[PDB]
Amino acid sequence: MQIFVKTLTGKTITLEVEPSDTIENVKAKIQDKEGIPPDQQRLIFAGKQLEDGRTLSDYNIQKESTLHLVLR
Ligand SMILES: [Zn+2]
Ligand SMILES: [Zn+2]
Ligand SMILES: [Zn+2]
Ligand SMILES: [Zn+2]
Secondary structure, rough: EEEEOOOOOOEEEEOOOOOOOOOHHHHHHHHHOOOOOHHOOEEEEEEEOOOOOOOHHHOOOOOOOOOEEEOO
């Protein structure tokens, strides 16, 4: 699965993942790409707040899905 993560500035990060990847995995990938610490990342897909220990398939995230880094 290719998924897109948009930063707070709207920059697009393209990530190669698997359905079973955790949100924690995806956070580490984001850190590698952009230097954003995982403890400072908060991810949403389709308005769902994404928990570190759940997987992409748990949230029905699919090929070409977009996640957003948000605040607060
Ligand atoms: Zn793929
Ligand atoms: Zn694998
Ligand atoms: Zn993985
Ligand atoms: Zn793997």
